[PDB]
Amino acid sequence: PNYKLTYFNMRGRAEIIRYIFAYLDIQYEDHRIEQADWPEIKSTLPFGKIPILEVDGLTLHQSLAIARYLTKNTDLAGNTEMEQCHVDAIVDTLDDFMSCFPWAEKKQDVKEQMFNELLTYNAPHLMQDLDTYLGGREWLIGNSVTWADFYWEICSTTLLVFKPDLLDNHPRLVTLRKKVQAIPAVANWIKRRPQTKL
Amino acid sequence: PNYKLTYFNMRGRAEIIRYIFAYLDIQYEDHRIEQADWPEIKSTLPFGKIPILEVDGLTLHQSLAIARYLTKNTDLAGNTEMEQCHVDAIVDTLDDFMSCFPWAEKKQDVKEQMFNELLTYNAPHLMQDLDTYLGGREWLIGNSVTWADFYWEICSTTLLVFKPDLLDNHPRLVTLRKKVQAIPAVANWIKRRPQTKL
Numbered sequence: 001p002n003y004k005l006t007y008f009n010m011r012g013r014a015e016i017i018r019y020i021f022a023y024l025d026i027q028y029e030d031h032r033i034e035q036a037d038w039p040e041i042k043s044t045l046p047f048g049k050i051p052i053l054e055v056d057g058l059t060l061h062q063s064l065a066i067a068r069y070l071t072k073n074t075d076l077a078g079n080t081e082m083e084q085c086h087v088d089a090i091v092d093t094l095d096d097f098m099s100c101f102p103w104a105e106k107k108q109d110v111k112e113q114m115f116n117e118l119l120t121y122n123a124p125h126l127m128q129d130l131d132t133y134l135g136g137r138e139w140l141i142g143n144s145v146t147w148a149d150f151y152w153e154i155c156s157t158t159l160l161v162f163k164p165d166l167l168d169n170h171p172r173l174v175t176l177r178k179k180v181q182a183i184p185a186v187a188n189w190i191k192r193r194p195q196t197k198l
Numbered sequence: 199p200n201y202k203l204t205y206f207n208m209r210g211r212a213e214i215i216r217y218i219f220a221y222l223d224i225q226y227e228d229h230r231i232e233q234a235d236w237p238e239i240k241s242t243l244p245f246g247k248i249p250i251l252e253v254d255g256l257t258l259h260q261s262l263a264i265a266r267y268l269t270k271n272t273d274l275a276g277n278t279e280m281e282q283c284h285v286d287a288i289v290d291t292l293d294d295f296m297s298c299f300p301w302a303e304k305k306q307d308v309k310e311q312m313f314n315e316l317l318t319y320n321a322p323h324l325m326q327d328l329d330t331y332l333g334g335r336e337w338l339i340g341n342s343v344t345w346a347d348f349y350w351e352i353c354s355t356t357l358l359v360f361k362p363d364l365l366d367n368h369p370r371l372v373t374l375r376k377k378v379q380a381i382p383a384v385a386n387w388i389k390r391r392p393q394t395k396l
């Protein structure tokens with residue numbers, strides 16, 4: 001199929017889709033827009049938000065809805081309906097936390113203060129929950145990589161930009177990040193992707 | 199399997215799971231806890247949030263992850279891979295909006311203000327988006343009911359508690375709620391369920 005991904009020049013909410021395409025060896029057009037192109041694109045969209053994915057001309061929206069759709073019938077989704085449930089739940093837990101951050105806050109001091117509170121209290125709590133959920137296992141769910149591990153690596157990459165020592169007491173979570181990054185298709189993608197802060 | 203759902207005594211985030219059990223005619227224990235006993239149960243949970251669904255000796259978490267699991271390979275899932283994506287995307291759009299509400303805000307004045315703002319300034323646009331998206335179809339996705347229709351009915355019910363006039367300019371959206379409420383299994387549940395505000 002002919003896939004076209006639209007988002008800003010940023011990892012952000014589209015990166016999970018980008019990892020999935022890379023891993024599954026699926027070709028797509030990685031369309032990145034500048035704000036000036038947005039108002040016009042936005043007006044054409046039923047829900048006015050990005051990312052969107054156009055599949056043979058038909059437009060899909062909601063990044064995680066799209067990610068799940070792409071992993072359909074692949075090992076990345078989870079090996080059973082039960083494992084798929086754990087995969088979806090871990091993804092949701094991570095998304096719930098990332099949504100706490102005031103990404104669009106215009107008062108720089110308020111943004112800094114909120115980021116700091118979230119990274120001092122909430123983040124370490126979640127890291128301990130994640131660390132114990134993973135235990136000494138290889139991947140978050142089951143015995144092979146799933147898009148939940150991808151989402152962990154992606155979310156943590158963003159959190160580390162703001163609190164570099166966040167995983168300093170969580171070597172098992174660091175090890176999970178390294179295992180995802182070392183998957184050849186992922187390693188390749190990380191090397192060639194546009195470099196952006198977020 | 200033996201199902202035990204744990205949540206507060208309210209529709210809230212567990213209601214979608216309750217409609218799914220009803221529709222699929224699956225018996226389950228509808229466990230509802232009092233606030234005072236929550237801190238104790240929270241301490242034993244891998245991620246400290248509810249609802250949770252215990253299936254056999256397994257605990258599951260994240261309401262939508264559970265809803266997705268229970269509807270997989272049932273007539274409540276989309277009819278094609280792409281329809282499944284649209285089902286997930288409409289649910290996520292509704293969820294994104296409902297999760298913006300500060301349900302756990304202890305400062306009453308701050309809470310009411312945020313509620314009023316979201317209901318007055320944001321809710322009408324979501325209604326516009328959903329109305330346009332539905333167009334003239336019978337259901338949100340495809341030619342038959344999906345759990346996205348259930349979620350729409352559930353979310354709108356709560357929104358109408360706070361803003362009764364929300365659907366005055368959207369008869370097609372009122373018609374959809376009525377269609378969902380007309381489904382025998384759903385009608386039966388709406389009639390017999392504990393009648394709570396939220």
Ligand SMILES: N[C@@H](CCC(=O)N[C@@H](CS)C(=O)NCC(=O)O)C(=O)O
Nearest residue numbers: 013048049050051061062063064294
């Ligand atoms: N949960 C949705 C969120 C969509 C969303 O909030 N997108 C943002 C960009 S990260 C957006 O388009 N907001 C700016 C705007 O629409 O004007 C998803 O993952 O796709």
Ligand SMILES: N[C@@H](CCC(=O)N[C@@H](CS)C(=O)NCC(=O)O)C(=O)O
Nearest residue numbers: 096210211246247248249260261262
């Ligand atoms: N995204 C999660 C949200 C779960 C959630 O935030 N539940 C609330 C109750 S509505 C909760 O457990 N909060 C009480 C607490 O965290 O102490 C889901 O859909 O299940």
Ligand SMILES: O=[N+]([O-])c1ccc(-c2cc[nH]n2)cc1
Nearest residue numbers: 210211293296297301356396
């Ligand atoms: O009254 N509540 O406490 C409450 C909490 C959450 C929701 C919710 C979140 C996403 N969908 N529905 C609805 C009601």
